[PDB]
Amino acid sequence: ASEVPQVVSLDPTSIPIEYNTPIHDIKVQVYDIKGGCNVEEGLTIFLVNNPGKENGPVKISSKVNDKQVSEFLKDENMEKFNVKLGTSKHFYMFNDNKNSVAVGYVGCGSVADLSEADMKRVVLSLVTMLHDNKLSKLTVVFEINVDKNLFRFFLETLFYEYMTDERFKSTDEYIKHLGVYINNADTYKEEVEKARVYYFGTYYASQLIAAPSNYCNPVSLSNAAVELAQKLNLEYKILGVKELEELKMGAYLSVGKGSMYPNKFIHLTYKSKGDVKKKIALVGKGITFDSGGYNLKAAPGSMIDLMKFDMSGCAAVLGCAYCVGTLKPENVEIHFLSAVCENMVSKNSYRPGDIITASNGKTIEVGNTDAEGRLTLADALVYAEKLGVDYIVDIATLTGAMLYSLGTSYAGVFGNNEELINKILQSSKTSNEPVWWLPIINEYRATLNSKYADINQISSSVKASSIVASLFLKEFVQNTAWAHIDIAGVSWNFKARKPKGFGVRLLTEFVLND
Amino acid sequence: SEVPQVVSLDPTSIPIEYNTPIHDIKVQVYDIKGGCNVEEGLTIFLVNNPGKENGPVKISSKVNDKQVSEFLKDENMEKFNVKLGTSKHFYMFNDNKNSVAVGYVGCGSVADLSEADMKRVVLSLVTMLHDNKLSKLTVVFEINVDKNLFRFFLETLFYEYMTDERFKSTDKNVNMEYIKHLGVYINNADTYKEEVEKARVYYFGTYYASQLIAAPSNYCNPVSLSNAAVELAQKLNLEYKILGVKELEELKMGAYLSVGKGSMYPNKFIHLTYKSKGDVKKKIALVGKGITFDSGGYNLKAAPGSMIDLMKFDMSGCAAVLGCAYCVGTLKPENVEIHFLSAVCENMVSKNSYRPGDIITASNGKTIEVGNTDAEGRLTLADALVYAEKLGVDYIVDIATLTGAMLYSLGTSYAGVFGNNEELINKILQSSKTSNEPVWWLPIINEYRATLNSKYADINQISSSVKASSIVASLFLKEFVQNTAWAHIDIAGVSWNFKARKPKGFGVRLLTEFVLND
Amino acid sequence: ASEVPQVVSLDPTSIPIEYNTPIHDIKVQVYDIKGGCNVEEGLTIFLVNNPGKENGPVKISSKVNDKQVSEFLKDENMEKFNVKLGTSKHFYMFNDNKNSVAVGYVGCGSVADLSEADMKRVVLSLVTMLHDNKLSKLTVVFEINVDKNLFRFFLETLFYEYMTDERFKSNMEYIKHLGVYINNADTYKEEVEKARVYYFGTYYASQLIAAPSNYCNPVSLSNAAVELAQKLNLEYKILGVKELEELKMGAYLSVGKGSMYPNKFIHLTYKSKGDVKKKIALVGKGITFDSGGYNLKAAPGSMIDLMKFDMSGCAAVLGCAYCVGTLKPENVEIHFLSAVCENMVSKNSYRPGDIITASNGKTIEVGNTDAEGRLTLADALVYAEKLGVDYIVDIATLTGAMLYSLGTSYAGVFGNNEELINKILQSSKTSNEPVWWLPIINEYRATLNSKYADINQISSSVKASSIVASLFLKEFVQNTAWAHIDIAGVSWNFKARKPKGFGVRLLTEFVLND
Ligand SMILES: [Zn+2]
Ligand SMILES: [Zn+2]
Ligand SMILES: [Zn+2]
């Protein structure tokens, strides 16, 4: 940890982090639906669908251990309501002990197998029932089929969407118990604490992303990474400017020349206690603010105000270290890397046209100072490869063109090894964080031929930027299976005006499945 | 106090002319009933024809000279008309056989002249003084004007006549001489005599504001401007205090300090005070926006129409306040205590600048999410308004070149006024009427307040959905006044005279009248 | 009826209009709150506040005539909920007779004086419940204070927002009963059928606006006006191209030159049965599609896809004819005028630079074909002044600058007569359609001095376009009190994606109170 420089004494010197969240105090109990449902304090919600009958009637199938409640929920009363996805209703009644109880349902539609996006919709409806109601307990009854992974996803999403970030509130009551009734409850029980770990990894990444760039700068972000490593007993090394110069990391150093915050390179290590059978490097893009540099983000739709989110890759990688440090997988050694800097406008900034030398000796002609993420990634990839790992996976908010290709719902994966790419797709399936494979088109490579330097940073002819940037990055991996995840489109949730913490669960499923 | 320089040729003060040639003009008001002596220089009749649009010129005064009277006969004048702003020059020999210049300016056919009408009349008169060498001008009012409008006539004649040559070097105007005497003939002269020296004080407050606004950003920076304010206070015997960065850190003025983080000039907060001898009945804070240059910061002013070359003028609010301090310090009103406040800084691009997305904390403890670094004026004004309210004052009035949207609502002639108290608003509209500086009341629409809701901070600096940005800025400002009558004058559209390529010094007379009226 | 031209046989030949709406089937009853509440049937909603306590607990005071619901409404239950403006909850339960009811509340925040905008939010939250409700009755309990006009505004807004427009389409049932409990119920009763009339005026204007330009064109619009006039027994005349040529309406006819639809000038008249003491012309801008013409709407932000709404003023004037023809004021004669045409790109369109002659003989130099609204209004105003009326009021979606001056909530009013402006502002207050007085600054008039014509259509220097447009219109009224209402910013509800029908209630209040 290093001292964070300040312009004025009011400049903050750390990122505030909440570790002990109210989600962590919630006691979760899972019961088997075969024993019937007890219905007492709090709110009890049934998840009901009607397969094949679009907006069909509600029917409650589980046994309920209360005669008054069973009478309320009989088919004759419930058929006046429907299962349209996301629809919900609240019921109030007195039970067999003459106590008042709150019951309800959320509609899960008429398709038997819910997609990740469907389930999020169900969760959002459920969370509007928790907001503005002081409840001590929620009980959820699954009258719908879900596999183990989708059940976990239900929990993670619930926790994440319910949790509210109030770190930056100044002048401006969570349940204590969650009951779940499900068929074959004993097989779903194992997902509960995994879900709690996954929730905090994602929420932790989200806290880092959402923290503005005066709070979250290269020095305070690397200090947060140190403090994480100390709580988790990971090994850690933060490389500063003198060390970076010695390693000849001139692509990464040039991007950070115009910042008042010194570059800091984050290297965290998890090692398994047993024989190591696989070595992995996870590389996240870490630009704490992206002004564009002398290629300033001034054009309509450039969104300079969103640019604190340009370290979302480093955040996903640190959220992954949290989950890995907590779950403790065997047989694996994982390095978590991020070349952290800030891209600013200064007398000291690198310029359009500058020629700079990366730590593998390749000279690069800078065509646009706003394509800085690929320069910092190029030195981090060289460093990752020198570690002698089996796989290198990077994750980055790299290109705006992602919005035009896959949009805000799916991230793109590119890579040089099909087996690795399949493992990432497999991890997408089991994490329920959607990614789609996109090609590295070798025909475009000639457009990176520089008249003067070994290579151009950008294409002056090809508009397919996310592909061009993957071609550039590929030049910095000589002999290792490598994949690149571009999360520029999926990282920020525009509708809810907050980060998704996207990638933490995807990467962690990758490591654990391996 | 010491102004930092990058090279030794960078200026270390704003040049300021105090004893201007207007101050050397001897002015005498004479009653028209005695008739006009016509003996030297230029004599101009202000003449109308009520009813008859572009009607003929007919002189109504007695003139105590046979020759000049002969020249001014109706038959001779009938070739000429009274269309607003039209003028003519005559040359003749009086009874003492000395050459004499005589003339008229047309004042139209509507016997009640607006502020804009009287401005056209003065402009034509000033064209008659330019490119001529004259020792004496006399003006004969053959029109009806109230006391305020007669004073406006003199203030405007003085301001428009005065030429600002501080930054000329090889191109100083060789042929520029000023009159030494001004005679005015008018009905019931004794009653207008009091307006002469008041006009002279109002002219200078206004010209002084103009000098600071016109001074480029390399002459007028936060250190040199706060230094000029100290000098002004010292000449007037006002109490004064300039708060520096260490004091502003202790006061926790985080919104104001974030704006100046990227500047080579330390933030300086100006606080001057005028206090009447005897009973203080009203305490007022006047707060002026004092951004000495506004580049936009990282939301740089790069879009077509953004006029970054005009942005030395973004301290026009602070100039108005300082010109007001001049008039107040000179005229010495009773029963008031006036605080003249400006949070002065410069909005620049640097490794040190604040960024879009940053969350900063104001001196009242409110956290603010920056959505655009070029909305910097309301961040500075938020901390200045907290400071003003902690002074225990009865009224807070701020004046500011805040939003370019003023050009689309009121344009270049009228300023907009917003506020939280209808009595205060009405006092401002009243002073608008007696100062002849036009203002229009605009609404603070509370339905837009929800668009300032921030997901992370207590409040957003800017709306992402509402385009009525002068209204949104006022709703933002209103959050920094808890329980005091407050009004806000947006002068972004009126401050610069685009036609004449100079400042208006808008606001000095409006604020003084407001103070003196109280 | 004129025949509607068609390019293909599938082109529509009329505007579909619903006259008998489900709102017209609602039986409304108003009871005094001091008597306590009958809650035995249907959905009951309490409007509740907590003055001084930001986000304070809900507390319901009314005595209710049901033991189950009474239990539900006890303080210990309701304090789980808060009063933040627009927040709502509602619960299904069984009443003392084991019939299904539902009960809830809508939060009215912590300030006793509700504004109109505040009241819209309350209504929207109530409407959200209604759009999921199939109980046959709604009871609204006012545990808050509102004046007569605000209560009528509550009803108008409830009816307007509840009603949904399904004319172009190929969960709920509309209620049949509405009960209101409010203090001084006897005085509020006279507001009910006035609200229902104002609601339909506003909805009918809305149906015209929302109808796309292939349904709603100069011929189909003026046909609709004739059918309206017939149903209300108003006098009517539609002026066609040959009559408009005889009348020398050169400015209006030039704007419509490029359209396939002939210009149609609408003139309806209501005349009171008694002595006529005031004569009024209401003139509405009626461009059924504004492409901009050769000055095409191609710049970012020009919103060409919204430009079916450029007949909003005409629609307001026609909604007002409905209300006036229904309510039948005494002592007045009202002329409802619109110069209807469509502004298109064609070999036949007028061009930037054309000099055109208005029906008062003034020659006009066209500087921009997208400032067509004021050309059509110039001839309409001349037409109106020849009728010999006491007051002319025009209403028009005239300048996009309105979004930069007053925004989307308040319209601007400009005029040549202080007393008429005062009556408009007073009607704004009583109709709850907000307007703000803006000046006609005479110093800008010189910017309309054309080198070649009598006058310019636009300024080439002044950016205050709403004022400049008003200066231009003012040249076409010689000696009559006139006011101009610019509703460009307030006519379309961008968040709800539908028209407001703005101006119907303001116009009616103006005519009813004069
Ligand atoms: Zn970037
Ligand atoms: Zn500014
Ligand atoms: Zn139009």
From Swiss-Prot, chain A:
Where, by residue number, does Zn(2+) 1 bind?
A: 290, 370, 372
Q: How does activity depend on pH?
A: Optimum pH is 8.5. Active between pH 7 and 11. Optimum pH is 8 for the cleavage of the Cys-Gly dipeptide.
Listed binding positions for a peptide are 285, 290, 297, 310, 370
What is the activity regulation comment for this entry? Oligomerization is required for catalytic activity and is metal-dependent. The type of metal that binds the 2 metal binding sites influences catalytic activity and substrate specificity. In vitro, activated by Co(2+), Mn(2+), Ni(2+), Mg(2+) and Zn(2+) with decreasing strength. Occupancy of the site 2 is essential and sufficient for activating the enzyme but occupation of the 2 sites is necessary for full catalytic activity. Inhibited by fungal metabolite bestatin. Inhibited by Phe-Naphthyl (PNAP).
Q: What class of enzyme is it?
A: hydrolase
Segment L13 loop: which positions? 295-312
* Segment forming the signal sequence: none
Q: Per its record, what are the GO molecular function terms?
A: carboxypeptidase activity; identical protein binding; manganese ion binding; metal ion binding; metalloaminopeptidase activity; metallodipeptidase activity; peptidase activity; zinc ion binding
Name the positions where Zn(2+) 3 binds: 305, 307, 310
Active-site residues, Swiss-Prot/TrEMBL: 297, 374
> Any binding details for the cofactor?
Binds 2 Zn(2+) ions per subunit. Two metal binding sites with different affinities are located in the enzyme active site and can be occupied in vitro by different metals. Site 1 binds metal with low affinity and can be occupied by Zn(2+), Mn(2+), Co(2+) or Mg(2+). While Zn(2+) has the highest affinity for site 1, catalytic activity is the highest with Mn(2+) or Co(2+) and less with Mg(2+). Site 2 binds tightly to the metal ion and can be occupied only by Zn(2+) or Co(2+).
PROSITE patterns in the record: CYTOSOL_AP
Q: Where is this site: Essential for hexamer stabilization?
A: 297
> 4Fe-4S among the record's keywords?
no
- Please give the superkingdom of this protein's source: Eukaryota
Q: Where in the cell is it found?
A: Cytoplasm
Q: What is its EC number?
A: 3.4.11.1, 3.4.13.-
Where this protein primarily resides, as one coarse class? cytoplasm
Provide the domain comment: The L13 loop movement regulates the transition between active and inactive conformations by repositioning Lys-297, which, in turn, mediates the rearrangement of the binuclear metal center.
Q: State what this protein does.
A: Aminopeptidase which preferentially cleaves leucine residues from the N-terminus of peptides. Also, has some activity towards tryptophan and methionine and to a lesser extent towards phenylalanine. Has very low activity or no activity towards the other amino acids. In addition, cleaves the Cys-Gly dipeptide, probably as part of the glutathione regulation pathway; cleavage only occurs in the presence of Mn(2+).
Q: How does it assemble?
A: Homohexamer composed of dimer of trimers. Both the identity and concentration of metal ions available dictate the extent to which oligomerization occurs; Mn(2+) and Co(2+) induces oligomerization, whereas Mg(2+) has no effect, and Zn(2+) causes irreversible protein aggregation in vitro.
- Its recorded name reads Leucine aminopeptidase
Per the UniProt record, the source organism is Plasmodium falciparum (isolate 3D7)
Gene name per UniProt: LAP
